[PDB]
Write a protein that binds this ligand. Sequence first.
Ligand code: CL
Ligand code: CL
Length: 250
Amino acid sequence: MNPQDKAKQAVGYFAVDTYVRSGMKVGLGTGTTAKFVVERIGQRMQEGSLKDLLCVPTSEATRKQAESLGIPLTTLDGIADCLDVAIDGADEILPPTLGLVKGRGGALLREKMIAAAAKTFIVAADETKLVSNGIGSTGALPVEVVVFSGSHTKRLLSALPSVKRHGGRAEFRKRAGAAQEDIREEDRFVTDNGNYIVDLYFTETVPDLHEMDKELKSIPGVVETGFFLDLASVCLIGKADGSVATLTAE
Ligand SMILES: [Cl-]
Ligand SMILES: [Cl-]
């Protein structure tokens, strides 16, 4: 595998080895890094060191992967207390507050529901996910939006003061497939919750995340944002050489 994937693998395995134990209720992320987390839980099960485990997937792609490996699955409805731990990746990680940008794989809503329901929310990422001064340098800030009047909601997002200030441009997430100021409905990515996703790109770095998050949320039709603020408790960062750095809040 390439250097980036050895890093994603090392950090996923590490997360599972260090924080997951038998009898826990575990949240499972979505994406190429979470793939290795799921894969490691599957291995420890078969090896006999992980039992009586209840897991909650953040996407239908994640359940399908965990299903194919015999990992027990449910939703937050079937959990009485809180998840002990939730493990997921991130698209951007802003130390030292550990504010994140998530949602580039389309699963922001449930990832946030699962993260908020966990006593400890753990992010596992490779080194390229770390940013400085603010967000928006590696890509888009996703915003989940309802289907009805989606284009109009996209335009509203574009016009928010914080978004104009940072030179924001809006665009719909495309489904995997072929590809005027908007794309056609059949080409728009639909989340597991039946919603579209509006991606915001900026020409400059956005340093005030809390301010922007409130503005994005002031628009009716916005279901959820890619900002994960004051949620990550721990952020694991892996390198190709297999080592891992641990960032902790408080
Ligand atoms: Cl995602
Ligand atoms: Cl578009």
